[PDB]
Design a protein around this ligand. Structure first.
Ligand SMILES: CCCCCCCC/C=C\CCCCCCCC(=O)O[C@@H](COC(=O)CCCCCCCCCCCCCCC)COP(=O)([O-])OCC[N+](C)(C)C
Ligand SMILES: CCCCCCCC/C=C\CCCCCCCC(=O)O[C@@H](COC(=O)CCCCCCCCCCCCCCC)COP(=O)([O-])OCC[N+](C)(C)C
Ligand SMILES: CCCCCCCC/C=C/CCCCCCCC(=O)OC[C@H](O)CO
Ligand SMILES: CCCCCCCC/C=C\CCCCCCCC(=O)OC[C@H](O)CO
Ligand SMILES: CCCCCCCCCCCCCCCC(=O)O
Lengths: 176, 105, 135, 182, 53
């Protein structure tokens, strides 16, 4: 099933990267009641908050991520979105390795490194979600950008497992 | 805000300022808003038996009216005249309205 | 599920997937049967403090297993402790005056309305101030 | 549990029963005089506490009591008039709040010297202003127009230790691989 | 078999573990939901006893 395995790996790599990049770009992570400058229903993201109704509707303001070393570090890490962006970068490099595998079948470690990038991307994604939720805590609902990040995590982990299966079976088949 | 641009009774603003203006209009008199020097509302010191603050200013003759948020009390009604109340109120309690911590577990 | 917030449950599920995948990865590319299915079964049984049929033997497998064991112990204890808290923890005029979720009224042109209007008592003055403005 | 079991003042009695929070009044005010001359059990208890307590719970100005509650980190409960209390709680830094009902009911009056010729006209002026809605409008202008489950934060450290352990395990696996592969 | 199934289930509920674990996917689904049920029920017993004491 190596053809189907490589198909799943490539399609999944593209899907994880697309979902995570959209999530990091779009602004529907959190539905709350704040203010775009009275409080109205808004829809914030990782960088901007916007009004969902009323006169100023469609008006967005940069999130003042900033207004205790731990509080300072959490606010810094959440302000720069280090972890979501790191997970996007690692998904990009994993995609590059998956593509490069076919154009260079001499080296085996290429697809193994793809798998490791995808697994690492998932872990960065988890840390981002935790930092984001924790920083918000310092009524509401989660939007579709949040769930795009979550689905990116699940797909990234699946593609990593498939990639490692491909590498294992190549070494098992060739060695014996 | 920017009282320096103004001088006299026109240096101040607030509910009682407009109320004094409206009372002056209806009664037909001119007036100068003098802030009490003590900065105290009014009380009879049990030792000296002297009234201080706005009530003292009224009784001793230094002032002719008091248009501050001055509560109607029995002790004050015995020494100064009060009109019908222009605002209701009561004594009330004012109180101040904790991040768990990363390793709080 | 009430003792823990929805975000804790969701992150427990994500952490479960991530632990299972990293246990599978460090076990395949290690000198010295944790395939992915068995890794998921080991992790599920570890979280339910129900043990298993296989434990990791490598240093990297044992680090992964150890931190998952620690996480499990803190999270399960937190569930039981907060459930014990929930199960252990107006009935007055003051109570009615302090809150604002319950609206309270009187009969119009009645002795009770007149009583509240002409009251000098703190609590009832607060009650009247609310009732006069309520819409 | 001790946490969830905790409770606020919500009334005057709850402030009188405890002694951890000091509560004061304005010096030379109607509130101090009201407490001094009271014969109600709770109020007599409160006065006996306030007169003897050291340092002086009393303050010199309303702003002074406001800053004392704001800077006492929730250890000071100021007893003031409801109108001032409401106005303050409606303005930033809105970290203060009115608790419970009123303790009594009274009102402000326009004062004049005893035997003054302004007494009658001022009374009639106040009645005119009250019947014409002027006092209502002024009040509305100057007061109104001014205007649990454990959370991820309680266990975030355990998540960070977990993901850090997974990262460390992957690094150790790579090091072992490179060592055993040479 | 049936007798070992009864022993596995009893040991799971008492949190004493076992000498055999399911190896199939269907056996593991059954075992997993019984493990979850056991965890909620025993935590509920301890928590409510703490409340009563
Ligand atoms: C067995 C393997 C263990 C693996 C252990 C691996 C190492 C675990 C790292 C945890 C450190 C967290 C930390 O210092 O948090 C700070 C807040 O920090 C934040 O709010 C940071 C938010 C981003 C987290 C990354 C507080 O730090 P502190 O003041 O020292 O408390
Ligand atoms: C309840 C508490 C414990 C009681 C359990 C003791 C009986 C153990 C099973 C008996 C059994 O195996 O006998 C036969 C059927 O046996 C049956 O059909 C009986 C089982 C009925 C189902 C139980 C539901 C209600 C319990 C009321 C089958 O014999 P076997 O094929 O040898 O089964 C394996 C037994 N061995 C491990 C000894 C080889
Ligand atoms: C042989 C295999 C063993 C390897 C795997 C074993 C893992 C088990 C334990 C993990 C927790 C360890 C980390 C404990 C957390 C420390 C946090 C800390 O020190 O916090 C400082 C404090 O918060 C200042 O304010
Ligand atoms: C490799 C292992 C194979 C895996 C074997 C499977 C068993 C998994 C165990 C139990 C968890 C299931 C219980 C959780 C059920 C989720 C539904 C729920 O909690 O409903 C909440 C509802 O949505 C209100 O908002
Ligand atoms: C090995 C770890 C897996 C353990 C499985 C535990 C079940 C988790 C269920 C999470 C569902 C999330 C829904 C939250 C409930 C709500 O907010 O109403």
């Amino acid at each position: 099933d190596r053809g189907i395995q490589m198909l799943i790996t490539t399609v999944g790599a593209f899907a994880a990267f697309s979902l995570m990049t959209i999530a990091v770009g779009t602004d529907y992570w959190l539905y709350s009641r704040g203010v775009c400058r009275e409080e109205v229903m808004t829809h914030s993201g990782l960088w901007r908050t916007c009004c969902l109704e009323g006169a100023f509707r469609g008006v967005c303001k940069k999130i003042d991520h900033f207004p205790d070393t731990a509080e300072y570090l959490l606010r810094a890490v959440r302000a720069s979105s280090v972890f979501p962006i790191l997970s996007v970068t690692l998904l990009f490099f994993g995609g590059l390795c998956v593509a490069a595998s076919e154009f260079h079948r001499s080296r085996h470690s290429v697809i193994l490194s793809a798998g490791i990038f995808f697994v690492s991307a998932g872990l960065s994604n988890i840390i981002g979600i935790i930092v984001y939720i924790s920083a918000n805590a310092g009524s509401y609902s989660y939007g579709w950008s949040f769930y795009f990040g979550a689905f990116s995590f699940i797909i990234a982990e699946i593609v990593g497992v498939v990639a490692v299966h491909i590498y294992i079976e190549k070494h098992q088949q060739l060695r014996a | 805000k920017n009282a320096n641009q103004f001088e006299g009774n026109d240096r101040y603003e607030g509910y009682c300022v407009e109320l004094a203006a409206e009372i002056a209009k209806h009664v037909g008199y001119s007036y100068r808003l003098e802030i009490v020097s003590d900065g105290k509302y009014g009380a009879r010191d049990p030792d000296t038996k002297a009234w201080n603050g706005m009530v003292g200013e009224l009784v001793y003759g230094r002032a002719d009216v008091a248009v501050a948020p001055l509560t109607i009390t029995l002790v004050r009604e015995e020494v100064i005249d009060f009109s019908k109340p222009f605002m209701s109120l009561g004594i009330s309690i004012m109180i101040k309205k904790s991040k768990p911590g990363v390793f709080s577990f | 599920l009430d003792p823990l917030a929805y975000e804790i449950w969701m992150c427990i599920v994500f952490a479960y997937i991530g632990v299972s995948v990293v246990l599978f990865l460090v076990s395949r590319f290690s000198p010295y049967e944790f395939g992915i299915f068995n890794s998921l079964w080991f992790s599920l049984g570890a979280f339910m403090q129900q043990g298993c049929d296989i434990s990791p033997r490598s240093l990297s497998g044992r680090i992964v297993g150890g931190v998952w064991w620690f996480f499990t112990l803190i999270i399960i204890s937190s569930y039981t402790a907060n459930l014990a808290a929930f199960l252990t923890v107006i009935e007055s005029a003051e109570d009615l005056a302090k809150q604002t979720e319950i609206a309270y009224g009187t009969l119009e042109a009645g002795s009770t309305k007149e009583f509240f209007r002409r009251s000098k008592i703190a609590v009832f003055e607060k009650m009247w101030t609310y009732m006069k403005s309520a819409e | 549990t001790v946490e969830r079991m905790v409770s606020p003042i919500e009334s005057a009695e709850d402030l009188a029963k405890q002694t951890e929070i000091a509560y004061g009044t304005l010096e030379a005010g109607s509130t101090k005089e009201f407490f001094r001359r009271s014969k109600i059990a709770v109020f007599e208890k409160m006065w006996t506490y306030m007169k003897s307590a050291e340092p002086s719970v009393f303050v010199r100005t309303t702003e002074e009591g406001m800053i004392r509650v704001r800077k006492s980190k929730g250890k000071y409960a100021y007893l003031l008039e409801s109108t001032m209390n409401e106005y303050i709680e409606q303005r930033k830094p809105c970290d203060t709040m009115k608790v419970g009902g009123n303790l009594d009911s009274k009102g402000y009056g326009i004062a004049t010297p005893k035997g003054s010729a302004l007494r009658g006209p001022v009374n009639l002026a106040v009645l005119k202003l009250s019947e014409q809605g002027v006092l209502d409008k002024l009040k509305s202008k100057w007061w109104y127009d001014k205007g649990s489950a454990l959370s991820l934060s309680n266990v975030a450290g355990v998540f960070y230790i977990l993901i850090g352990g997974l990262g460390l395990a992957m690094l150790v696996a790579l090091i072992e691989f490179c060592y055993k592969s040479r």
